[PDB]
Design a protein around this nucleic acid. Structure first.
Ligand SMILES: [Mg+2]
Ligand SMILES: [Mg+2]
Ligand SMILES: [Mg+2]
Ligand SMILES: [Mg+2]
Ligand SMILES: [Mg+2]
Ligand SMILES: [Mg+2]
Ligand SMILES: [Mg+2]
Ligand SMILES: [Mg+2]
Ligand SMILES: [Mg+2]
Ligand SMILES: [Mg+2]
Ligand SMILES: [Mg+2]
Ligand SMILES: [Mg+2]
Ligand SMILES: [Mg+2]
Ligand SMILES: [Mg+2]
Ligand SMILES: [Mg+2]
Ligand SMILES: [Mg+2]
Ligand SMILES: [Mg+2]
Ligand SMILES: [Mg+2]
Ligand SMILES: [Mg+2]
Ligand SMILES: [Mg+2]
Ligand SMILES: [Mg+2]
Ligand SMILES: [Mg+2]
Ligand SMILES: [Mg+2]
Ligand SMILES: [Mg+2]
Ligand SMILES: [Mg+2]
Lengths: 394, 131, 63
RNA sequence: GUUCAUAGCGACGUCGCUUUUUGAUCCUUCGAUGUCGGCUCUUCCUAUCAUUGUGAAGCAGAAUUCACCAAGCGUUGGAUUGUUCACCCACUAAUAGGGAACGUGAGCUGGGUUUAGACCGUCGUGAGACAGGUUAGUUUUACCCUACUGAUGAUGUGUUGUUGCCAUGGUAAUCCUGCUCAGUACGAGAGGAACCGCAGGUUCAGACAUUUGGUGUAUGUGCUUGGCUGAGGAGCCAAUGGGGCGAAGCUACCAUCUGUGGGAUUAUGACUGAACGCCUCUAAGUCAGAAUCCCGCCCAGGCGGAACGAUACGGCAGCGCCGCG
RNA sequence: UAGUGACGCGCAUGAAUGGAUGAACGAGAUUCCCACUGUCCCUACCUACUAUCCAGCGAAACCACAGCCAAGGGAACGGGCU
RNA sequence: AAGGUGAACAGCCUCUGGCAUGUUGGAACAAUGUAGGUAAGGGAAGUCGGCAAGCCGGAUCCGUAACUUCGGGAUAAGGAU
RNA sequence: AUGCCUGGGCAGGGCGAAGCCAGAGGAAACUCUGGUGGAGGUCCGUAGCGGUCCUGACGUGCAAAUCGGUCGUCCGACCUG
């Protein structure tokens, strides 16, 4: 018989292989479509979730009650030190798919990149790419590399570049760099190949590809939560207190005549650590990392045109469970998937951005730097010392 | 042209709020909230500035035993504004209104939240304090 | 932005933080956190609480 | 139906479909297949209530009903009754109809049927009977197989590692309000639209804790009752002694963020053009065409492949290419 | 469709097969109101013991053979047959 | 049949006396459980039914209605310390 | 299960029946006020006795009927060898 009262189902059937993610680094399933009219550029980057803070900004939406009004919005900080290009990969179209054609690496590979090639770096002899680099310093090897580049230019239609992060500049415990293919979109195949070859063994800052007030995509893995019940995994209704054999369950698993439980029935299992791809994340501010000309330059992280202070994005005592942000960082509106120290993949929008919200210009007015390790109440140590005055430990 | 900017709802069906006008009514028993599509087993709830159907439980016998439209003036539930401040009013209050938004009474006791004042000009006209 | 002063303690309140309380008589108060809000709602006098700014002003602490 | 059989209905007659009603039969089950409802949950049907696209008027606008492709997404909160059913209050675009052993008791409950104790009314001499009422009346077991949810893994790739492709499966977004249009089109007046735009909301899905709230045994820091270390100090016991405030972590439309594009076309409306010297969307050919279907975005990744690095100096060893036995 | 207060037309009320009433009392059966609260909106978090893994010790129920589905026919609802 | 608190042979702590936590120990703190709790706003809207939980609670000083078999109701109810 | 014989046992509090004393009013009949008194198949409540609810735990159990909270009674038609 039909159910007495209709109700929408719990959860989405389009998201339910609910398995612990096989990969840790976020994966770009589909790069932006390539058109041979715009200049060459990258479409992906790797960052690390540092923390979250406030923002103050005037709204510029006519007709809204919030027009020309200051608002407080949550923003997340993603530290993005520059990446190093180490190789390129070519692809050829096939009626079966798109298989890789040829991969060429650079003569010099950093130890951080070589960390990824070994499961046990301590026990390893660090022999990776020992014979490969002999090609770059020999006439026969140079001729072979020239032939490889010519073949990729003649046959390949999709070109991707291998780049790795600089884990030395991060405060994280791990030292193994993250290596990812980044697709180069731009002019013809030859132009993209030559541009990628020029960028070999070179650092690519994040500001080259991403700009201010731009909608991007964030790709990463969700926070892991282990084995969870159906009440928490699928947000089903709880049975009343009188229930004998447990109330944090689903009462009717299925019907009789189909003598199986369908795949659409909510059940207990792994919750969290799922690969996700969010869309329409707006870049409020692209920050400049610590640099030294005479002394330290820390103002640019958290100084605005209205504050003009020497603050940094790091709160008092630093970011909780992450550390201190020293390199370049990207400020995204709202929240992103993953926990602290989680590597996040920044991807360009796959859609044309023509909207009032998408084209809105962002002008920061104030950045909150109060300590997140408790109920902070002072922006800087100087303000705290001025308010409190001298203490016993002086 | 202005929007509503939804806030936390803390007055479900069955809540009894005190009337804040000189009509004579003392309490307003909320029986439903206008403009609620509804979900299974979900009790409709009302924020400040929302039209509701209310019934007077104690007060003048004329107003009792019938349904009156009402608009919530204050609520103890702390709701977030677009500028990042959470506000609550220490008491839940409302006034008896008609279908077109004209108040039945003539004076309002206590402050009125700015959301209700902006949404209902007639209420804001007789409001003594705003927010 | 206009920074507010806590009605109980006296510290500055930034737009992100704090909590606003409107009394029925027609007065509005600002609180840093649940500590000051609970102290205020319990009718505790701020001049008897050592860490409040008003107490330090009363006792001429510092300076 | 003012005139007019077919805008909308339709008697007297007649032809059908369904097993979501009660019936007829006793074919399976009496070495036992746990029943009526309610709660929870998934899926399916269309005989379409609303939304998308359209044809019709006794369609001027608004509104209204008739019909077509169409089940993608929705179809609510309560008073009474165990109730299915039923009626009312309120909101809403709508509160459409049903199946899945009259879905669902090793999922729950036991309110009513339906054991044993009793009360009332009727019947009987009586023991007792009553689709007549009332009251109290034990709801067992999964550790087996499959199915499902997740987690190790497995055959080949000489061994390992990195970066990737993809066949296949799942799939998702939905509806409403306010401003302008516009008191305009329309209309004697009363009344009274729509498209493109702007600001937002409901339901749903995926996240996250900067802020607000919750939790709190970091048993963190004060304050306290009774007792115990002779007392002060410092502490302990009273299954977490009690009570304030409370870090981090989890967590709430109870805070915050995000939710997408093409192709083929259905109904329909058309172009050219005969059959049928005329006319015709159709016969040949062609156009526009949607909550429809498929795919893209998204999630998983084949007893499925690809490129690249190192490939066992040893104290015994073992390999990789070449040719010729 | 509950409860209470009035009517009697009482299928089938009625006077020790006792009628009516009635203070106090009742782990007796019902209605409403005040306060209260996670019963609920709408769930979350914390504690102890299990469940989990390990060392040792270690049963029972049950068992034609066994165990992936759609439709057909069939003892008119199949894991086996097509 | 001791001391303290306490109206008390109530509950809690202690002395004389007794014992090893009740047919085993170690490592983590997943889901479901069993036993305790806390929850912003609403306050029974849940359910057949306020089931369960919660609210009140000791003592002192005030005050205490209808009804009644005049005995009660009664710690009625409601206040302050 | 019931009768009989012979033994044992049942904290701490509340309400306050007869009887009695003193004071005041009355012409008498007698009536009020404040005390004393401790009766009751009296009340709260422990031990004991029993088993309403959670239709809780368990339900190849600790147990062929036990366990936790909450409960009725607890000077008499009381409980018990
Ligand atoms: Mg339905
Ligand atoms: Mg039960
Ligand atoms: Mg924090
Ligand atoms: Mg019309
Ligand atoms: Mg059935
Ligand atoms: Mg079953
Ligand atoms: Mg059962
Ligand atoms: Mg029953
Ligand atoms: Mg019986
Ligand atoms: Mg007879
Ligand atoms: Mg001391
Ligand atoms: Mg099309
Ligand atoms: Mg076409
Ligand atoms: Mg056609
Ligand atoms: Mg009722
Ligand atoms: Mg008779
Ligand atoms: Mg009789
Ligand atoms: Mg069989
Ligand atoms: Mg123990
Ligand atoms: Mg032991
Ligand atoms: Mg609460
Ligand atoms: Mg109870
Ligand atoms: Mg009484
Ligand atoms: Mg039981
Ligand atoms: Mg069991």
């Amino acid at each position: 018989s039909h159910r007495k009262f209709s109700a929408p189902r719990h959860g989405s059937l389009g998201f339910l292989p609910r398995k612990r993610s096989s990969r840790h680094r976020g994966k770009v399933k589909s790069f932006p479509k390539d058109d041979p009219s715009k200049p060459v550029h990258l479409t992906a980057f790797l960052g690390y979730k540092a923390g979250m803070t406030h923002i103050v900004r005037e709204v510029d939406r006519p007709g809204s009650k919030v027009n020309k009004k200051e608002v407080v919005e949550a923003v997340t900080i993603v530290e993005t030190p520059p990446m190093v290009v180490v190789g390129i990969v070519g692809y050829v179209e096939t009626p079966r798919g798109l298989r890789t054609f040829k991969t060429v690496f650079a003569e010099h590979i950093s130890d951080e990149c070589k960390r990824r090639f070994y499961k046990n770096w301590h026990k390893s002899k660090k022999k990776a790419f020992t014979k490969y680099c002999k090609k770059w310093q020999d006439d026969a090897g140079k001729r072979q590399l020239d032939k490889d580049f010519s073949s990729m230019k003649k046959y390949c239609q999709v070109i991707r570049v291998l780049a790795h992060t600089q884990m030395r500049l991060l405060p994280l415990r791990q030292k193994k760099a993250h290596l990812m293919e980044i697709q180069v979109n731009g002019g013809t195949v030859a132009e993209k190949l030559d541009w990628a070859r020029e960028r070999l063994e070179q650092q690519v800052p994040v500001s080259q590809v991403f700009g201010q007030d731009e909608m991007i995509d964030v790709i990463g893995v969700t926070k892991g939560k282990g084995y969870k019940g159906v009440t928490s995994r699928w947000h089903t209704k709880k049975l009343p207190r009188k229930t004998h054999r447990g109330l944090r369950k689903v009462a009717c698993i299925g019907a009789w005549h189909p003598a199986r439980v369908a795949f659409s029935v909510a059940r207990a299992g792994q919750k969290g650590y799922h690969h996700r791809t969010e869309i329409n994340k707006k870049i409020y501010k692209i920050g400049q990392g610590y640099l030294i000309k005479d002394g330290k330059l820390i103002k640019n992280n958290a100084s605005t045109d209205y504050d003009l202070s020497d603050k940094s994005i790091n709160p008092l005592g630093g970011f909780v469970h992450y550390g201190e942000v020293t390199n370049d960082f990207v400020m995204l509106k709202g929240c992103v998937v993953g926990t602290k120290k989680r590597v996040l993949t920044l991807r360009k929008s796959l859609l044309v951005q023509t909207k009032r919200r998408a084209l809105e210009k962002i002008d920061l007015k104030f950045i909150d730097t109060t300590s997140k390790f408790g109920h902070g109440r002072f922006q800087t140590v100087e303000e705290k010392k001025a308010f409190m005055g001298p203490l016993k430990k002086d | 042209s202005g929007a509503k900017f939804r806030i936390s709802l803390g007055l479900p069906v069955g809540a009894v709020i005190n009337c804040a006008d000189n009509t004579g009514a003392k309490n307003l028993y909320i029986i439903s909230v206008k403009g609620i599509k509804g979900r299974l087993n979900r009790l409709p709830a009302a924020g400040v500035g929302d039209m509701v159907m209310a019934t007077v439980k104690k007060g003048k016998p004329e107003l009792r035993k019938k349904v009156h439209p009402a608009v919530v003036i204050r609520q103890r539930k702390s709701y977030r504004r677009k500028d990042g401040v959470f506000l609550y009013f220490e008491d839940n209050a409302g006034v008896i209104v008609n279908n077109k938004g004209e108040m039945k009474g003539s004076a309002i006791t206590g402050p009125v939240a700015k959301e209700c004042a902006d949404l209902w000009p007639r209420i804001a006209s007789n409001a003594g304090s705003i927010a | 932005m206009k920074v507010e002063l806590c009605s109980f303690s006296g510290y500055k309140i930034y737009p992100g933080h704090g909590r606003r309380y409107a009394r029925t008589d027609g007065k509005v108060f600002q609180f840093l956190n649940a500590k000051c809000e609970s102290a205020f709602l319990s009718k505790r006098n701020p001049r008897q609480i050592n860490w409040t700014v008003l107490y330090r002003r009363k006792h001429k602490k510092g300076q």
